[PDB]
Design a protein around this nucleic acid. Structure first.
Ligand code: MG
Lengths: 97, 106, 95, 87, 95, 106, 82, 97
DNA sequence: ATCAATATCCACCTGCAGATACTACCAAAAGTGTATTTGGAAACTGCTCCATCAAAAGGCATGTTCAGCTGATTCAGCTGAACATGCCTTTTGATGGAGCAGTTTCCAAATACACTTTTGGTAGTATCTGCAGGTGGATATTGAT
DNA sequence: ATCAATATCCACCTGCAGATACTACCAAAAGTGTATTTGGAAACTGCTCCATCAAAAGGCATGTTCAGCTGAATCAGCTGAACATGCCTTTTGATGGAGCAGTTTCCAAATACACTTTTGGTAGTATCTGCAGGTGGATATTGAT
């Protein structure tokens, strides 16, 4: 039974996703969270579909960019596995804290 | 009657740029060369990006520039990238980049 | 049925100048339009501040010029200015 | 209106596979199992801030609908400028 | 010779209300003044933007409030609004 | 005659704030209450920072606020620190802080 | 005893900055890296300030030229006007 | 004969310079650097005394804040010695690179 | 553990740098009054586009396996902190003049206004065309051996 | 290196969403021409405050020593990738209807000037004191034993 070595599909995936531009979070699930959070701010709110779509393009962009920063932080610690400390270090320097 | 764009030799609307500088509440008065210069820069920058975007569209064997090609144009260009340093291009993706340490073997 | 203004006809014009065999998705155009809107606000802004700091109630192409040298990086600034200078110069004489 | 379902725990809609892909687009090869909760946390903060600002724009315009332009202005306000979804 | 306005006397008045026996160094007052100018420019900036987005020609106290809510942190935003409303209410209800 | 600042119960000049709002090219028109509100907001904030730097001077056995005090006041308060998160107070130094992994082992 | 101007930002000076920054141990290579960094900071800030000076048609770079440049680089500074 | 251990004075200095607010570059050698840098932008310039001060205040503040992030980076890699890569990592995540 | 060297703390002292109170002024706000211009709430109704639901299409969760990564341990060797002072670079104050800033001035270019032409959007109906995503079918890449 | 399992890469291929085309009109631009105001360059000029330097100050470049920190090397445990398996959830196309936004009518409020009053900023004067340094003498920290 044939198997790929750990890390080989991963770099396959990276080659693939850096190529494509499609959003990576499922639409509806992301729509729900937007709605749940907004509700907590204010009730009976409605969302132009392109508002949600703005918010997803925005967030994914933000999260992806953050993963690069995160990934650089890991490599600094002479690792290849990103950890919450790497996210945390990235965000502190960024002035998000 | 000859339009002010053609007067200044621009495809971009000098009329409109003049008008938008007024409602925009930037100053009390808007000089005559202000919108001409502004239109000229605005025209220049968009020409600069479309030249580059067009290439990324050709490299990709496509005829139509999509947001990926815009993103590829800006990001691969030092001076454009800095200008749009804090700007996100919807549906543009990222530049292919894998850090060396992640590649296999040695 | 209110009218929505954009630089789309102008962008396209300039698109055919550079690549006459190349079209543009309405989305790329949608971005190309934001880009001109964005850069407008930014140069206008600096010009706006620039005048205030000099007790000037007028933005002349000179303010647009320092605004451009402040805003745009290195070689982009250098070329924009030239085109601005060129267009203003070709405007002054043509009436 | 007759009955509108309760929204809760939707953050778990941001699945492990979805987060992974994002990290892959980020160029991430290996992901510690604690990341997905941490990313979810971070995304929650992100949205909360953009939405608070967006909604504020909505309410100032006395609307009940959060417009695409509401979000676009909230984004430029926080220095996360977005092209492609309006003015 | 020319007049150079400041917030200094009004900052100083407020200091005396808050800490009657405490003074302020020149440099600290120059920072205080800078701060007041900064926040004014920010809030007016936002108030300006709100008006535009809604196609309104007036900057009203409603604008200034939404501007405050967008710029200031929670407790600081809340208290500011209460002080902002309180002052607008007192001023109105006085012949 | 009676000042709009005394009418609002404020120390901060409503008239000046109104003046500066007009000549500031922010919109075509300035509403009557807007400068009152704004003056209040600015005043309040001025009081908040002088309060904390007042205490910051007291803590350090002092009676005159120097820049240092204003810096201790801002950076030690979570909300003021966020508002001034991208501002530098001249001659303010930094908060006493050493990373606990740099401390000598006991 | 000719010496570079940037080298005027001495090791003990750079160390004191590092100290206020709470740095305990400093690699020797830092002092050259830091000097490089300071050069980029100043070029960027000065370029913009001088650009304000030229617009005002002046030969003297004024504190406001600097303060404004600082504000526009996003490095707002209090205590010198504005 | 008497000698303090490495890192003991360092700590003593950290504690000292965080108490004070006086600038830590000598005025003159700085001022020349300022002028030398400006000469590439315009010849025969003059500098307001307060203007060089504004520039110093800002440069020092900047650098001191940069060392903080640099130091958080060195610690992240499980070190206590700030190295050029730490400054570089701090800067890239900030956006400066 | 003690022991001595020296860093650090604090109470008291005081000249003077930098804060503060005090006066007569005048240009310039800020306020008061009346004439005018308008911006936006209000109330009404077209109609876009949002919530919501039903069918249909595809990525999600989950358990198992073990590859190789992380993190601990150890260790050697390199590399940066500590040290003392006269050398030389900066700081301090003294004095010439550059140029910024305040003043008056006048015209080239700003605004205002008013009919007169142009044109950029849309709107309704049309045809054109680039390419997404299906197909197979020839060419790598990877990892077992 | 060689064999085989499967990813990858084109290349053409037919449907069709999205782009392109033009025809009709039309409100709102942009234009043009002229009467009317003025912003700011220009030119002169006074007096800060800036470049310079002489003497006074006091920080740092130096080169030796070894404490201890970095980075290599080694390895045990177990975490996270790969993948198979079984199906739930999202996606996608379709239909009444909330609220947004287009237009119109109407006034409380905001702007424009003028005239009356005042306030804040300077300035020139002397008037005042908080606290930076210096001191002395107790006590804590560090490093050695
Ligand atoms: Mg809830």
């Amino acid at each position: 039974p044939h198997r790929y070595r750990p890390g080989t599909v991963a770099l396959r995936e990276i080659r693939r996703y850096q190529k494509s531009t499609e959003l990576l979070i499922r639409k509806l699930p992301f729509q729900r969270l937007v709605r749940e959070i907004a509700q907590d701010f204010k009730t009976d709110l409605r969302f132009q579909s392109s508002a949600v779509m703005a918010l997803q393009e925005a967030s994914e962009a933000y999260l992806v960019a953050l993963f690069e920063d995160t990934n650089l932080c890991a490599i600094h610690a002479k690792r290849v596995t990103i950890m919450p400390k790497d996210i945390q270090l990235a965000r502190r320097i960024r002035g998000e804290r | 009657a000859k339009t002010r764009s053609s007067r200044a030799g621009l495809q971009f609307p000098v009329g409109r740029v003049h008008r938008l500088l007024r409602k925009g509440n930037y100053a009390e008065r808007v000089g005559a060369g202000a919108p001409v210069y502004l239109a000229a820069v605005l025209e220049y920058l968009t020409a600069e990006i479309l030249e580059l975007a067009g290439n990324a569209a050709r490299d990709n064997k496509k005829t139509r520039i999509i947001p990926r090609h815009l993103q590829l144009a800006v990001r691969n260009d030092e001076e454009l990238n800095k200008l749009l340093g804090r700007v996100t291009i919807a549906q543009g993706g990222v530049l292919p980049n894998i850090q060396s340490v992640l590649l296999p073997k040695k | 049925k209110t009218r929505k203004e954009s630089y789309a006809i102008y962008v396209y014009k300039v698109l055919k100048q550079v690549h006459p065999d190349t079209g543009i998705s309405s989305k790329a155009m949608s971005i190309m339009n934001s880009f001109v809107n964005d850069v407008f606000e930014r140069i206008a802004g600096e010009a706006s501040r620039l005048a205030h700091y000099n007790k000037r109630s007028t933005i002349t192409s000179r303010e647009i010029q320092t605004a451009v040298r402040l805003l745009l990086p290195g070689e982009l600034a250098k070329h924009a200015v030239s085109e601005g200078t060129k267009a203003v110069t070709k405007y002054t004489s043509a009436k | 209106k007759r009955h509108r379902k309760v929204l809760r725990d939707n953050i778990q809609g941001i699945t492990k596979p979805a987060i992974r892909r994002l990290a892959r687009r980020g160029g991430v090869k290996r992901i510690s199992g604690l990341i997905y909760e941490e990313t979810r946390g971070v995304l929650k903060v992100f949205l909360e801030n953009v939405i608070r600002d967006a909604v504020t724009y909505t309410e100032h315009a006395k609307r009940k609908t959060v417009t695409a332009m509401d979000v676009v202005y909230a984004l430029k306000r926080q220095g996360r400028t977005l092209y492609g979804f309006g003015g």
